Write a protein that binds this ligand. Sequence first.
Ligand SMILES: CCCCCCCC/C=C/CCCCCCCC(=O)OC[C@H](COP(=O)(O)OCCN)OC(=O)CCCCCCC/C=C/CCCCCCCC
Ligand SMILES: CCCCCCCC/C=C/CCCCCCCC(=O)OC[C@H](COP(=O)(O)OCCN)OC(=O)CCCCCCC/C=C/CCCCCCCC
Ligand SMILES: CCCCCCCC/C=C/CCCCCCCC(=O)OC[C@H](COP(=O)(O)OCCN)OC(=O)CCCCCCC/C=C/CCCCCCCC
Ligand SMILES: CCCCCCCC/C=C\CCCCCCCC(=O)O[C@H](COC(=O)CCCCCCC/C=C/CCCCCCCC)COP(=O)(O)OCCN
Ligand SMILES: CCCCCCCC/C=C\CCCCCCCC(=O)O[C@H](COC(=O)CCCCCCC/C=C/CCCCCCCC)COP(=O)(O)OCCN
Ligand SMILES: CCCCCCCC/C=C\CCCCCCCC(=O)O[C@H](COC(=O)CCCCCCC/C=C/CCCCCCCC)COP(=O)(O)OCCN
Ligand SMILES: CC(C)CCC[C@@H](C)[C@H]1CC[C@H]2[C@@H]3CC=C4C[C@@H](O)CC[C@]4(C)[C@H]3CC[C@]12C
Ligand SMILES: CC(C)CCC[C@@H](C)[C@H]1CC[C@H]2[C@@H]3CC=C4C[C@@H](O)CC[C@]4(C)[C@H]3CC[C@]12C
Ligand SMILES: CC(C)CCC[C@@H](C)[C@H]1CC[C@H]2[C@@H]3CC=C4C[C@@H](O)CC[C@]4(C)[C@H]3CC[C@]12C
Ligand SMILES: CC(C)CCC[C@@H](C)[C@H]1CC[C@H]2[C@@H]3CC=C4C[C@@H](O)CC[C@]4(C)[C@H]3CC[C@]12C
Ligand SMILES: CC(C)CCC[C@@H](C)[C@H]1CC[C@H]2[C@@H]3CC=C4C[C@@H](O)CC[C@]4(C)[C@H]3CC[C@]12C
Ligand SMILES: CC(C)CCC[C@@H](C)[C@H]1CC[C@H]2[C@@H]3CC=C4C[C@@H](O)CC[C@]4(C)[C@H]3CC[C@]12C
Ligand SMILES: CC(C)CCC[C@@H](C)[C@H]1CC[C@H]2[C@@H]3CC=C4C[C@@H](O)CC[C@]4(C)[C@H]3CC[C@]12C
Ligand SMILES: CC(C)CCC[C@@H](C)[C@H]1CC[C@H]2[C@@H]3CC=C4C[C@@H](O)CC[C@]4(C)[C@H]3CC[C@]12C
Ligand SMILES: CC(C)CCC[C@@H](C)[C@H]1CC[C@H]2[C@@H]3CC=C4C[C@@H](O)CC[C@]4(C)[C@H]3CC[C@]12C
Ligand SMILES: *C/C=C(C)/C=C/C=C(C)/C=C/C1=C(C)CCCC1(C)C
Ligand SMILES: *C/C=C(C)/C=C/C=C(C)/C=C/C1=C(C)CCCC1(C)C
Ligand SMILES: *C/C=C(C)/C=C/C=C(C)/C=C/C1=C(C)CCCC1(C)C
Ligand code: NA
Ligand code: NA
Ligand code: NA
Ligand code: NA
Ligand code: NA
Ligand code: NA
Ligand code: NA
Ligand code: NA
Ligand code: NA
Lengths: 240, 240, 240
Amino acid sequence: IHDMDYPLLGAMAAICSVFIGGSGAWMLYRLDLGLGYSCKPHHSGYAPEANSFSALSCLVSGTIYAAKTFDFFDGGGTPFSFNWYWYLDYVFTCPLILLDVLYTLEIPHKLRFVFAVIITLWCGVAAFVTPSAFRFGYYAVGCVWFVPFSFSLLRHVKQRYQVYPPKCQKLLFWACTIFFGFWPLFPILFLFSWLGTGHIDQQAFTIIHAFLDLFCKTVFGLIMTFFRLELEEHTEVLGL
Amino acid sequence: IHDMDYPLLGAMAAICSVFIGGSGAWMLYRLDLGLGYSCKPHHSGYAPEANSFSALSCLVSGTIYAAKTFDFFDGGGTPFSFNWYWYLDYVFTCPLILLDVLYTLEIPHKLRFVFAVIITLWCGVAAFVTPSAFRFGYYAVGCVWFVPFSFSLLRHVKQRYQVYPPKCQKLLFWACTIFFGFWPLFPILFLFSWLGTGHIDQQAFTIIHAFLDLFCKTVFGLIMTFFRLELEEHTEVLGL
Amino acid sequence: IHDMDYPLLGAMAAICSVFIGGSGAWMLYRLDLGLGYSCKPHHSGYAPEANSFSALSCLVSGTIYAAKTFDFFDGGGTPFSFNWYWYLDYVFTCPLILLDVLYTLEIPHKLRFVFAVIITLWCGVAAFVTPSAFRFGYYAVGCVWFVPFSFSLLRHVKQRYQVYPPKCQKLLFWACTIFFGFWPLFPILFLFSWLGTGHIDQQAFTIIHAFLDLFCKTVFGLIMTFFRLELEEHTEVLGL
Ligand SMILES: CCCCCCCC/C=C/CCCCCCCC(=O)OC[C@H](COP(=O)(O)OCCN)OC(=O)CCCCCCC/C=C/CCCCCCCC
Ligand SMILES: CCCCCCCC/C=C/CCCCCCCC(=O)OC[C@H](COP(=O)(O)OCCN)OC(=O)CCCCCCC/C=C/CCCCCCCC
Ligand SMILES: CCCCCCCC/C=C/CCCCCCCC(=O)OC[C@H](COP(=O)(O)OCCN)OC(=O)CCCCCCC/C=C/CCCCCCCC
Ligand SMILES: CCCCCCCC/C=C\CCCCCCCC(=O)O[C@H](COC(=O)CCCCCCC/C=C/CCCCCCCC)COP(=O)(O)OCCN
Ligand SMILES: CCCCCCCC/C=C\CCCCCCCC(=O)O[C@H](COC(=O)CCCCCCC/C=C/CCCCCCCC)COP(=O)(O)OCCN
Ligand SMILES: CCCCCCCC/C=C\CCCCCCCC(=O)O[C@H](COC(=O)CCCCCCC/C=C/CCCCCCCC)COP(=O)(O)OCCN
Ligand SMILES: CC(C)CCC[C@@H](C)[C@H]1CC[C@H]2[C@@H]3CC=C4C[C@@H](O)CC[C@]4(C)[C@H]3CC[C@]12C
Ligand SMILES: CC(C)CCC[C@@H](C)[C@H]1CC[C@H]2[C@@H]3CC=C4C[C@@H](O)CC[C@]4(C)[C@H]3CC[C@]12C
Ligand SMILES: CC(C)CCC[C@@H](C)[C@H]1CC[C@H]2[C@@H]3CC=C4C[C@@H](O)CC[C@]4(C)[C@H]3CC[C@]12C
Ligand SMILES: CC(C)CCC[C@@H](C)[C@H]1CC[C@H]2[C@@H]3CC=C4C[C@@H](O)CC[C@]4(C)[C@H]3CC[C@]12C
Ligand SMILES: CC(C)CCC[C@@H](C)[C@H]1CC[C@H]2[C@@H]3CC=C4C[C@@H](O)CC[C@]4(C)[C@H]3CC[C@]12C
Ligand SMILES: CC(C)CCC[C@@H](C)[C@H]1CC[C@H]2[C@@H]3CC=C4C[C@@H](O)CC[C@]4(C)[C@H]3CC[C@]12C
Ligand SMILES: CC(C)CCC[C@@H](C)[C@H]1CC[C@H]2[C@@H]3CC=C4C[C@@H](O)CC[C@]4(C)[C@H]3CC[C@]12C
Ligand SMILES: CC(C)CCC[C@@H](C)[C@H]1CC[C@H]2[C@@H]3CC=C4C[C@@H](O)CC[C@]4(C)[C@H]3CC[C@]12C
Ligand SMILES: CC(C)CCC[C@@H](C)[C@H]1CC[C@H]2[C@@H]3CC=C4C[C@@H](O)CC[C@]4(C)[C@H]3CC[C@]12C
Ligand SMILES: *C/C=C(C)/C=C/C=C(C)/C=C/C1=C(C)CCCC1(C)C
Ligand SMILES: *C/C=C(C)/C=C/C=C(C)/C=C/C1=C(C)CCCC1(C)C
Ligand SMILES: *C/C=C(C)/C=C/C=C(C)/C=C/C1=C(C)CCCC1(C)C
Ligand code: NA
Ligand code: NA
Ligand code: NA
Ligand code: NA
Ligand code: NA
Ligand code: NA
Ligand code: NA
Ligand code: NA
Ligand code: NA
């Protein structure tokens, strides 16, 4: 039950908020500094509108983990708790992470992809709060939205993986590893959680997701940031 | 009260999810196939961004009816139930249906119209959960947003009903019949429901709305899809 | 506690809904009338898409105050009550007010600014419902998002305050006074409220916020409307 050693989870949540939140703040600073590695002024002058999704996803996640930190240190149940409804926080963060990939890579069908992940996460929120055997009904519906989304999105990334120069491809390889290697790791964790098989307790479930958000938001956002800097440093700083 | 024969409503909800959800899936397949009846590749190559609203509205509604199916078969009240808050589901579906009309017909004031329907539905959600005599206060406020919206939107459709060729006008006539003939049928049903006059019980209220969503989303979405195909088959496949 | 003389607050809420709601309705009428003071037809023909934020913010606020009026006159606690969760209503209105400034003045970073105010208000909603000493944790996180937002947004406004002619600058001065003089007055009120210091009771807290919304939405929206009319009357009606 809710015997999760909140001081440990509150301390863990505080670290995630600082590192995830701090990483987002750093990315905002780098946005309004230049185009690529060189301090070349932006064509519009301030920054492209679509370059802030990597920074915003970490800032929003860092803020949400700050809310988690308050909830844990408050002793457990709180009127405004992101820990009560699992995957509810990811509803407002995954679209930003996804939009970072779509706009950075110029992947079409940006409207369909965003809806496919929002509904995927909402099915997770509904699956979590359902105490009956129908919790896997919502889970199945979520996978129906997710599997075509991941496979369809993967195909688009492969198409545009070729145009980029080999130097940028190395950075895009590690972004793909996190995006296509860690995102499908959340539904797997659901099956093995206390709601599913039972091999992962709630306290350990929070800790693992804390590390997943570090890679999915901070590490992934920084990789996208440096991929973008490398992309601009080669495309619009000296030609081609 | 809540004596609604959930097995009947769950079975009905399952049919709606498959047909509405399946219709949305079919429309997605047709999008990435060609411009019109002929398999002419799209100008952008994949598809226009605004052609997915018809498909997304049915997919979202089909997913929501899947959630309704779980709620009904679970025995009634569920922690994640779309049946507890009536008209809450339409908040996330009507804008998609409306945006299908606005972008397909290129009707201006797309920002005002979307807000007018979202507030209209929210007043319905508030009107439903209010047990006091003020439930008609929210209903009246909803109609204040709806009547100018329907009349103002109707005027715009009449303006652009003339430019389209007679073959496309026939398809637009039936889209207008559903959009301007069934949408005002929901507020009428509210007055005659158990909350209003009392002539429609809750069980019958769900069944009627199930059929309305079949016409408002599946039939309407398909009519828009074929109107779009007919429009493209005449405008950007052979000239004018 | 909840001894707030609801008939007084309901009567006050009704006045705000009519004046704020009515002002938004008036601004919609002026939009589809002409460009500036003269009745010059719009370049697009109907209206720019970004000119409706001033009208929509008042219409949404007027509608929400109508919901508040029902909640107060119903006797207090209501299933659909905007008065139970303070600052929840501002989540759906402040972005519209902010977007009015951003699009009217063409301030870049429109995506970052909107997120900075939505998270700022959500921290206020969480801060309000928290009964523990951590209510100031959410408040502090909200100020962390707000102070950089207000200072960063202020710098942008100063940059574009110079290009406009002196006649338009006078109208922009009073918009800045409300935007940068009243917005920071809400967090100050939180500290002195019954949740903070204790010098402002809940009944007086509602009355003060009623007057703040009159200036922040109605007066501010009208100033933006006339600033826009003055701007168009000088830029795209006779040249420069
Ligand atoms: C359910 C939660 C889902 C979360 C997703 C929310 C994020 C929404 C994604 C926004 C997509 C916007 C596309 C960005 C790329 C556009 C690039 C561009 O040109 O920008 C257009 C222009 C900026 O550039 P200009 O100054 O015109 O520069 C051109 C001259 N140099 O305006 C824009 O940036 C587009 C609009 C900006 C945002 C408008 C508001 C949209 C909503 C914001 C977030 C709120 C929704 C999330 C709700 C939070 C929970 C309640
Ligand atoms: C309260 C619930 C309300 C529900 C409404 C949500 C739907 C929001 C409507 C989105 C409007 C977008 C306009 C679509 C037409 C634009 C056509 C276009 O050119 O697309 C721009 C470009 C795609 O094309 P490019 O690759 O640039 O192609 C050009 C080169 N060939 O990007 C776009 O599609 C625009 C932005 C895409 C979506 C961005 C995210 C917006 C939010 C998504 C839905 C989430 C909100 C609903 C919340 C769900 C409940 C929590
Ligand atoms: C969490 C609550 C946050 C609230 C914020 C919601 C507001 C979202 C802001 C929308 C930003 C749109 C930018 C407006 C400027 C664009 C100007 C423009 O050219 O418009 C594009 C074109 C209109 O013009 P055309 O007919 O192409 O004219 C060109 C030929 N003369 O389309 C548009 O207006 C852009 C898209 C319109 C809105 C699409 C739907 C977006 C969502 C609407 C609000 C719903 C979200 C709020 C949720 C409410 C709570 C559940
Ligand atoms: C119901 C209307 C919902 C409308 C949306 C409003 C937003 C919700 C804001 C929080 C209000 C919560 C009030 C709950 C009252 C206290 C209940 C409580 O104690 O909490 C839990 C139950 O309630 C919750 O925990 C509800 C938490 C809701 C949190 C949802 C957060 C959504 C915010 C969106 C943010 C978008 C991203 C921006 C970042 C924000 C950073 C702060 C335990 O319940 P008890 O009453 O003790 O009963 C059990 C004891 N026998
Ligand atoms: C309060 C914070 C709200 C913040 C938003 C969070 C989203 C809500 C997700 C569901 C959490 C529900 C937890 C409720 C706990 C159980 C309560 C319950 O049993 O259910 C009902 C009451 O609660 C409900 O039914 C609440 C249902 C909320 C559903 C709202 C769905 C919104 C989702 C948006 C989706 C956007 C579109 C994507 C498609 C999704 C497809 C799955 C009966 O109440 P009891 O406690 O039995 O009391 C009566 C017994 N004497
Ligand atoms: C929980 C799922 C949330 C999902 C979103 C659904 C939207 C919520 C719509 C309102 C449903 C409220 C049902 C609450 C059941 C009654 C509870 C009640 O009596 O009210 C309060 C508690 O509940 C509330 O007050 C919840 C109010 C939620 C209002 C949130 C409004 C959000 C709407 C967004 C609108 C977007 C802008 C458009 C303008 C709309 C204009 C109408 C007092 O509680 P009692 O049960 O008496 O317990 C105390 C007695 N010992
Ligand atoms: C430790 C406390 C202050 C929180 C710091 C969190 C953020 C701000 C820190 C954590 C790790 C940091 C990154 C570590 C390594 C690099 C590589 C270097 O070539 C550029 C800076 C960059 C990308 C750093 C930016 C700042 C960073 C993202
Ligand atoms: C493949 C796509 C198109 C269809 C997806 C159908 C999914 C949602 C269906 C297939 C089998 C179904 C499950 C079959 C049996 C049960 C047992 C019951 O006591 C609870 C519901 C539950 C667990 C069902 C939930 C819904 C379910 C998982
Ligand atoms: C559990 C996790 C960490 C490991 C799984 C990582 C997976 C997702 C990684 C490992 C190898 C990667 C692939 C390596 C090569 C290519 C070819 C390129 O043209 C498109 C991307 C694509 C197809 C990558 C997609 C992501 C990928 C499949
Ligand atoms: C019965 C089960 C499989 C659910 C099927 C639901 C969806 C996929 C079905 C229901 C009715 C079907 C439509 C029936 C008639 C036509 C007209 C034809 O000229 C093109 C296909 C089209 C438009 C069909 C597409 C698929 C469709 C929309
Ligand atoms: C026409 C526009 C601009 C104004 C709309 C005003 C509407 C919202 C007003 C007009 C008359 C009002 C009703 C008058 C009397 C009552 C009885 C009371 O016990 C509950 C509220 C209720 C039912 C009111 C709700 C609000 C109401 C319906
Ligand atoms: C109860 C329902 C099914 C029947 C009511 C259907 C109504 C909404 C239908 C019946 C006839 C239709 C009208 C027929 C002709 C025109 C002229 C055209 O230039 C614009 C659309 C317009 C104005 C239609 C709007 C929709 C309409 C009024
Ligand atoms: C009193 C009742 C009807 C509610 C009226 C509310 C709205 C519609 C009223 C309140 C104050 C009014 C404004 C008062 C002064 C002016 C200045 C004038 O040069 C143009 C009209 C304008 C801008 C008015 C427009 C209508 C207005 C905004
Ligand atoms: C400046 C930025 C980057 C960091 C902001 C840190 C804020 C959120 C920190 C600084 C000091 C903290 C407070 C320190 C002590 C307490 C007492 C405790 O019983 C409740 C929480 C509370 C009230 C903390 C809430 C969070 C807090 C306000
Ligand atoms: C409590 C409230 C009502 C009074 C405080 C009003 C403040 C916010 C007002 C008073 C004077 C105003 C400043 C007057 C002059 C300028 C210079 C211009 O180039 C940019 C705006 C700017 C910088 C204004 C910003 C808003 C401002 C600082
Ligand atoms: C930073 C957080 C991220 C990137 C979270 C991603 C989460 C998912 C891809 C979750 C997917 C799920 C499904 C496929 C179905 C079942 C429920 C979920 C929510 C675990
Ligand atoms: C697929 C579902 C659709 C198209 C639903 C449409 C619903 C409406 C137009 C509802 C309108 C209402 C009002 C006019 C006021 C009172 C409340 C409503 C919600 C019934
Ligand atoms: C019409 C209403 C408006 C313009 C409301 C504006 C509200 C704010 C700027 C609120 C700000 C807050 C913070 C800075 C932190 C603490 C909580 C708030 C919500 C009071
Ligand atoms: Na957000
Ligand atoms: Na994936
Ligand atoms: Na990727
Ligand atoms: Na949705
Ligand atoms: Na209508
Ligand atoms: Na129509
Ligand atoms: Na709204
Ligand atoms: Na400010
Ligand atoms: Na301003």
